[PDB]
Amino acid sequence: MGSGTATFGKRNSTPTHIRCRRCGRVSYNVKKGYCAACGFGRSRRLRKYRWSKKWKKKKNAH
Amino acid sequence: AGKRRVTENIGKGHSMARVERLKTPPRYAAFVPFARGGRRTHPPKVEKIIWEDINKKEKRLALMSAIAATANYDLVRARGHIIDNVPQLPLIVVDDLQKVQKTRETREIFKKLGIWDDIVRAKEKSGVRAGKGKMRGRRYKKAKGPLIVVGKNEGIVLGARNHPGVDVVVVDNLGVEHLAPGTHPGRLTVWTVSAIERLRELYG
């Protein structure tokens, strides 16, 4: 679409995800059951990647 | 460093240069030769020159030349080393000199011979260095005095290292650095009968 979108919707209001407790990010999806910052509610592993994208952020965060 | 931040384009349309800065804060850059925290044109490598071969013949001739400079009074004085014994250079002393490793007893033989005057120079710090190089270390040094060459009593002698500028060696492990430090020739040597006899023989 077309620039000028920010007066139309009172959005963000009520989320579409919530505060995790495996990482505390605001991505534990209440309409599924999946964490998209580290995996939880569908998973017993943390995400395992050699990108690094996550692994690096996490180490610095830790 | 200098690929630490992604580098994304500010573009044209607003009348400034099209030269990339960053995403979130336009205030720094990367993958440019400017910026805090960045690369230049090409950083310094670990791969830089650090070995230089020299041929066995070529190295040996250098040793011969540097020891020849020592036996000429004029070169020794030019380097700054001042000697009482004008007609005699280098000095050979009796074989007993090695065994002595009282710092004070081995000092006295030097004083008499007139070769303490070089050691006074090294008492004065002349390896003093200006600039901020003090921060990295390796200043306030002593000047290289005479060279004491022994046959044995190990490679270092325990009554000939304490003295200023007196650096100890053996004739099996002799080197161009000891003969003419800095590529300035004209540094005194002092022999022991067993070293002099063993150097007569050529090793390579």
Partner: protein
Amino acid sequence: MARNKPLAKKLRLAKALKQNRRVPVWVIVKTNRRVLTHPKRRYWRRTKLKE
């Protein structure tokens, strides 16, 4: 309501409440020159705030 604050979230909010205080005097004497007040002071119109 506002909906709604579980038991742990009142604790978090409470941590957040503490931070919005200026640094007390006794610290600055103890350091012996000085510690500026330093941004963790909270507004309520101007504060939107990821979790």
